[PDB]
């Protein structure tokens, strides 16, 4: 919370955000997390099935 930084410009300091309440699929277009990210699974809804055409 708060933490008023004692420096001058907004262009010389980066910022981040650590939200851990929800979880995301490991895309190839997202940066990898810090350490051990767990292997928790979601089902794939529309699987292949052998039908009649």
């Amino acid at each position: 919370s708060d933490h008023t930084t004692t420096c001058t410009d907004v262009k010389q300091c980066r910022a981040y955000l650590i939200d851990n309440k929800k979880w995301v699929y490991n895309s190839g277009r997202l940066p990898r997390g810090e350490g051990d990210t767990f292997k928790g699974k979601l089902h794939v809804p529309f699987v292949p099935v052998k039908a009649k055409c």
Partner: protein, 49 residues
């Protein structure tokens, strides 16, 4: 001054359980048939031999 990892890895697709090319090796095996038999004054009776 930065570093991006970007590893890649090949695994089996999810449609491989429904169509795939099984690769068999064939040796000689049994021969079966089916016959229709009548004789004299009886009807046709069939069995697997």
């Amino acid at each position: 001054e930065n570093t991006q990892m970007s590893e890649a890895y090949v695994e089996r697709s999810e449609e491989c359980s429904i169509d795939h090319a099984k690769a068999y090796k064939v040796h000689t095996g049994t021969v079966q048939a089916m016959v229709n038999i009548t004789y004299g004054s009886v009807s046709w009776r069939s069995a697997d031999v």
